[PDB]
Amino acid sequence: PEEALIVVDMQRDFMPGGALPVPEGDKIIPKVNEYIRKFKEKGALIVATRDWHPENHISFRERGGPWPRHCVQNTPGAEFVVDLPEDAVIISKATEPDKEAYSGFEGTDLAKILRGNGVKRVYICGVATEYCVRATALDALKHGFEVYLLRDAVKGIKPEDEERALEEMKSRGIKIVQF
Ligand SMILES: [Zn+2]
C-alpha cells in the first residue's frame, strides 16, 4: 500500500489501571480502533508497535531505571487494548535486558518492512504523545516517509509536554490531521 497506520504501544499497562497509565488513555481507544477499521478498508498496511520487555529490563526501577515494571513479555500488562486485524504487522521493541527502545524503529525492522510493502506515507497514533509517539514519528521522518499525526488518536501524560511535542513535530515537518 502507499500508506500505513502505525499504532504505538496501545497496551494494557499504558491504560488507566495499568502499571504505567496514560491519563484518560482509554478515551482514545474507540477512535484508534476506528482508524484501524478505516485503514483496513482503504487496504492500507496496519502496524502495531508494542513494548515487549524482559523481566529486569534496564528501564525499570529495579535496575535504577526511570519506570515501574511494565509491558513484560508474555504478561497481561503487555497485551494490546485495541482491535487488530489478522494481517496487522506486530513490531516488538526493547526486548533485550540492557537496551531501551522508545521508537518503534529503534532496533526493529520497521523501516525495512514499510519499504518492502511499498509504503510512502505513515499515520501515527497511540501513546504517549511526548514519548514513544514523538520518537516514532521523528524516526519515520528520518527514513523519508511523509508523516501524519492523528490528532484525535494520541494521548500524552503531561499537558505541557504533549503541547511541546506536538509543536516540535509540526516544525520538523510532521502534519497534524484528523478524519
Ligand atoms: Zn518501556
Side-chain angles (χ1 to χ4, degrees):
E2 294 193 353
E3 78 275 24
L5 175 70
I6 307 179
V7 180
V8 175
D9 295 359
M10 286 301 294
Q11 293 170 272
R12 176 161 322 158
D13 273 336
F14 296 132
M15 300 293 109
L20 197 36
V22 180
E24 301 185 337
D26 55 327
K27 284 178 192 295
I28 58 163
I29 297 176
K31 186 58 82 174
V32 166
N33 275 338
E34 179 180 332
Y35 279 120
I36 287 155
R37 296 200 304 277
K38 248 168 257 220
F39 274 67
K40 167 198 60 202
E41 291 184 294
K42 292 144 117 119
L45 186 61
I46 295 173
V47 181
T49 69
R50 61 179 179 180
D51 246 4
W52 193 244
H53 291 317
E55 286 295 357
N56 208 49
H57 189 254
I58 183 138
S59 71
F60 299 164
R61 275 160 191 173
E62 55 196 81
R63 265 192 63 204
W67 309 113
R69 177 180 178 277
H70 63 277
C71 298
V72 171
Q73 297 150 3
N74 307 317
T75 71
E79 291 182 353
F80 288 122
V81 300
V82 290
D83 294 345
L84 293 169
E86 211 52 58
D87 57 350
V89 180
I90 305 310
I91 294 306
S92 300
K93 69 194 160 74
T95 68
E96 290 169 358
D98 300 325
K99 258 193 248 219
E100 171 70 296
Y102 277 92
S103 158
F105 289 89
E106 305 184 39
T108 72
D109 305 321
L110 179 52
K112 313 208 115 280
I113 287 155
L114 289 176
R115 281 174 192 127
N117 283 102
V119 169
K120 298 167 106 140
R121 331 175 264 287
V122 302
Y123 289 82
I124 308 191
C125 65
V127 302
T129 302
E130 65 270 52
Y131 285 95
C132 299
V133 165
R134 171 189 171 275
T136 298
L138 285 178
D139 274 357
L141 209 54
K142 271 183 235 215
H143 288 299
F145 304 103
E146 204 186 351
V147 186
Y148 302 81
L149 189 283
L150 295 175
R151 192 170 154 137
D152 57 344
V154 295
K155 190 117 294 197
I157 299 125
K158 318 181 165 149
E160 317 285 88
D161 289 349
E162 302 165 89
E163 272 216 272
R164 272 58 149 171
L166 271 342
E167 169 154 32
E168 171 186 13
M169 291 188 267
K170 182 178 242 217
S171 84
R172 308 262 281 274
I174 288 140
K175 290 73 153 153
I176 302 162
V177 309
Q178 54 201 95
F179 52 92

